[PDB]
Structure formats: structure tokens, C-alpha cells
């Protein structure tokens, strides 16, 4: 790996610089290098890994959706034949996106998840596994699509089980996991009722626990609760 000669601490330092410069591909490459040093990641380091890849894959997903919409329009009645270029370029972006997802899933499998014993790390990594299988599902059309969807589901479900046993209902990781698994139900698994029920129950159980929190923890939890409410408003 091209980061093999750089110190772990230097990679983390540069990831933070790359974030300030909005250089998210660099940030992700630095964090990949840091993971590949083989040591477990701290809370802050897990967040840097997450932010870097979220921004890279989020840009790819946005571009894929633009291209897929153009491709869909090209296939409607009365549309002039424009050649293979739209499909080719959508496939190019799709393949790069799949490559990023495969890289993240590879880091999680070698060996972040198996060494993650505390709920805050294990839930975080299993949520990420669900998320990156969800991004693969968004673009999947082949024989393995059901298995990709089920891989996302399985990862989310393991994270949910741990989070409900080991974290308070206001924990931001627990909340963000529920938010994203609810989106999985709505957008991937054709299960809008499950999506709505999960978001509502998560929101209500968090509300009931806010009284236990400091002002700063309250801010953290209510920020994610508002996202749950935003989705419920969208869906009802």
C-alpha cells in the first residue's frame, strides 16, 4: 500500500488536514492507510474514516443518480438513439462506486469488526457494513441482488441487536443506525411500514430518555432525532 511508509499518526494528521481542505479522496486514502497499520481505531479515528468515505461515496451516488436518470429518459418512447455512451459512462461511475464500497467492506472485514468488542465500536462498524451493502444494493440489478440486500439487512440487524442491549436509546450511534436501517427498509427492502414503525419507535424511546442527559449530550441526540422526524414527515 502506498501509505505503508507513512507513520500512523502522520496519516491521521493528514486526514484531518484533508478534511479541512475538502479533499475527501485524500482523506479516505489516508484513513485506509491508518486502518491498514493493524491497530484498533479510537472514537475520533472511526469518525474520520466514516466522514471520508461517506463524502467520497456520496459524491459517486449523486453522480450515478444523474446518469441513471439520463439513461432512463433515453430509453423512453420517442427518444432519439444516442449510442452506448450514456450506459457506458453510468457503468464507469457505477464500477468506481462499487470499488469504493468493496474497499470499505474489505477494511471492515480485515480486520476492524472482528477486533471490535465495545458496543460503541462494534455497532459503528456493523452500521457501516450495512450502509456500504446498501449502496451496493442501490445499483444492483444482477443475480446476486437479493444476497446484497440480505447482507445489508444482516449487518444492520446485528448492530441493532447490540445497540438495544448495550446502549441507551439516546446514544447517537444507536440513533443513526436506526435512522439508516429505517431508510434501508423504505428505499431498499420495499418495507415502508417497517421503516415508519422503526423511525417512530426510535424517536419516542429517545424522547423519553432525554431527561438523563447533559446539555451537550442532549444537543447531540436531538440533532439525530430531528432527522428521524424529517423522514417521518416525508413518509406520512
Amino acid at each position: 500500500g502506498a501509505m505503508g511508509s507513512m507513520e500512523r499518526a502522520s496519516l491521521i494528521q493528514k486526514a484531518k488536514l484533508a478534511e479541512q481542505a475538502e479533499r475527501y479522496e485524500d482523506m479516505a486514502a489516508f484513513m485506509k492507510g491508518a486502518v491498514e497499520k493493524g491497530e484498533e481505531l479510537s472514537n475520533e479515528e472511526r469518525n474520520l474514516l466514516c466522514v471520508a468515505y461517506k463524502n467520497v461515496v456520496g459524491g459517486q451516488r449523486a453522480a450515478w443518480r444523474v446518469l441513471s436518470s439520463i439513461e432512463q429518459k433515453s430509453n423512453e418512447e420517442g427518444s432519439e438513439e444516442k449510442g452506448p455512451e450514456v450506459r457506458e459512462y453510468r457503468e464507469k461511475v457505477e464500477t468506481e462506486l462499487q470499488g469504493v464500497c468493496d474497499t470499505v467492506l474489505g477494511l471492515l472485514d480485515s480486520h476492524l469488526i472482528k477486533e471490535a468488542g465495545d458496543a460503541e465500536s462494534r455497532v459503528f462498524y456493523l452500521k457501516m457494513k450495512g450502509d456500504y451493502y446498501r449502496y451496493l444494493a442501490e445499483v444492483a440489478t444482477g443475480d446476486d441482488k437479493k444476497r446484497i440486500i440480505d447482507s445489508a439487512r444482516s449487518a444492520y440487524q446485528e448492530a441493532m441487536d447490540i445497540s438495544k442491549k448495550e446502549m441507551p436509546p439516546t446514544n447517537p450511534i444507536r440513533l443513526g443506525l436506526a435512522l439508516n436501517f429505517s431508510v434501508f427498509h423504505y428505499e431498499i427492502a420495499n418495507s415502508p411500514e417497517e421503516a415508519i414503525s422503526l423511525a417512530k419507535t426510535t424517536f419516542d424511546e429517545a424522547m423519553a430518555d432525554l431527561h438523563t442527559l447533559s446539555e451537550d449530550s442532549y444537543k447531540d441526540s436531538t440533532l439525530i432525532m430531528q432527522l428521524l422526524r424529517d423522514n417521518l414527515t416525508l413518509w406520512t
Binding site: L179, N180, L227
Partner: peptide
């Protein structure tokens, strides 16, 4: 699109 984090 719905919100995710």
C-alpha cells in the same frame, strides 16, 4: 432523498 448519517 431521505436523511441518513
Amino acid at each position: 432523498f431521505p436523511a441518513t448519517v
